[PDB]
Amino acid sequence: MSLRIDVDTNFPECVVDAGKVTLGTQQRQEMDPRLREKQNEIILRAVCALLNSGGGIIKAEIENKGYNYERHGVGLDVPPIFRSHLDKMQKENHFLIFVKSWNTEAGVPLATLCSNLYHRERTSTDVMDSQEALAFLKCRTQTPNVSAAALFDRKRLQYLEKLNLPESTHVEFVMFSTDVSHCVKDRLPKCVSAFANTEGGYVFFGVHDETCQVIGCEKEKIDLTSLRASIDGCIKKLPVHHFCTQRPEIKYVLNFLEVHDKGALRGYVCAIKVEKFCCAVFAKVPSSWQVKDNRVRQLPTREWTAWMMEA
Ligand SMILES: [Zn+2]
Known part of the structure; x- marks a missing residue:
């Protein structure tokens, strides 16, 4: 569903490119409400992507000039059980998230944004x-x-x-x-x-x-x-x-x-x-993502169910 987010698995760990992004608590709260939503999704789709592909790094290019990390907050809505996998950190006008493999945390074989069940x-x-x-x-x-x-x-x-x-x-x-x-x-x-x-x-x-x-x-x-x-x-x-x-x-x-x-x-x-x-x-197709061939691609309902039952 929706937009195409480009990733390239050159070298070792793969790197999902979230692109332009505004950051921090306060100034993501004074964003275009219909773009604090647009961005926060590409992140959660790529975080879930790598959660289900052994791990990766998300490269983001900061929008709001003069972001300071320990002083503006992160301002991203992330599922709770996802965060036990999330090392965030900065570098000039660029921002990195390291995603550790989901490794069947909670006995649930994979990371799912939303089951639609x-x-x-x-x-x-x-x-x-x-x-x-x-x-x-x-x-x-x-x-x-x-x-x-x-x-x-x-x-x-x-x-x-x-x-x-x-x-x-x-x-x-x-x-x-x-x-x-x-x-x-x-x-x-x-x-x-x-x-x-x-x-x-x-x-x-x-x-x-x-x-x-x-x-x-x-x-x-x-x-x-x-x-x-x-x-x-x-x-x-x-x-x-x-x-x-x-x-x-x-x-x-x-x-x-x-x-x-x-x-x-x-x-x-x-x-x-x-x-x-x-x-x-299902009301629609399980929102649930892998890194398949240099794009983040959604998991189809037959695979998502199978994937959940390897347990
Ligand atoms: Zn039946």
């Missing part, structure tokens, strides 16, 4: 850190709420109507952004992944959470004929890895619950039912 415990959808996901992958490697489902095939609803049904491990209420497609096209896969991986459930799009109130969306800023297409294109795009023989699809069900107010046919709630799943469903 979600699961919804109690009232809350989190991703699993590579600790969590290693166990769930070990635990799915073996083969073999009623009110909620009444609401799922209602046919009318009332604006601001506060439903009886709290968010739980089977019920999640999420609210429409201004764009309906580019909200649901993004918020969905996390949900689908969560529910598939954790006992299945219902995502109610266009319902306030903290109050379980119906809301909806203007009956005109959405188009039910295409939103089912784009919804079905999104779910069949989800990366899944199978342990079993059977090998299904993700079984799911989409209903459009009309909102009303003053008998007036205004609005919409988007409901998706995701049935428990056989193996594992």
Whole structure:
């Protein structure tokens, strides 16, 4: 995903080139917020790169003139368990990070920025850190709420109507952004992944959470004929890895619950039912990186899972 970061393994240890970078605590906090993000990523991708390729050095070229190391801070957001591998240090208008081989620290065979393996415990959808996901992958490697489902095939609803049904491990209420497609096209896969991986459930799009109130969306800023297409294109795009023989699809069900107010046919709630799943469903492809042939290249989902199970 994203940008190409160039590395060259000449001589001994390989050297990832992070290029231009602003540094320090304070002056990375007065950066372009959409570039304190852009830079901090190339670092974390290259740190993870070498974590999974025996070790290396990241060469960075300092932007902010007159950086002083012991006096400006490092100002980089780095995963915690990564830091037990991180010797940082300066040299004129240039900065070096030495990455020691990951060497299966935590019993997890590799360094992963983000698993994209979600699961919804109690009232809350989190991703699993590579600790969590290693166990769930070990635990799915073996083969073999009623009110909620009444609401799922209602046919009318009332604006601001506060439903009886709290968010739980089977019920999640999420609210429409201004764009309906580019909200649901993004918020969905996390949900689908969560529910598939954790006992299945219902995502109610266009319902306030903290109050379980119906809301909806203007009956005109959405188009039910295409939103089912784009919804079905999104779910069949989800990366899944199978342990079993059977090998299904993700079984799911989409209903459009009309909102009303003053008998007036205004609005919409988007409901998706995701049935428990056989193996594992990723929201996108595990963010996880190696140094393969003079670029940092992302690990594909079949390899990332295999790589985690060498344990
Ligand atoms: Zn399966």
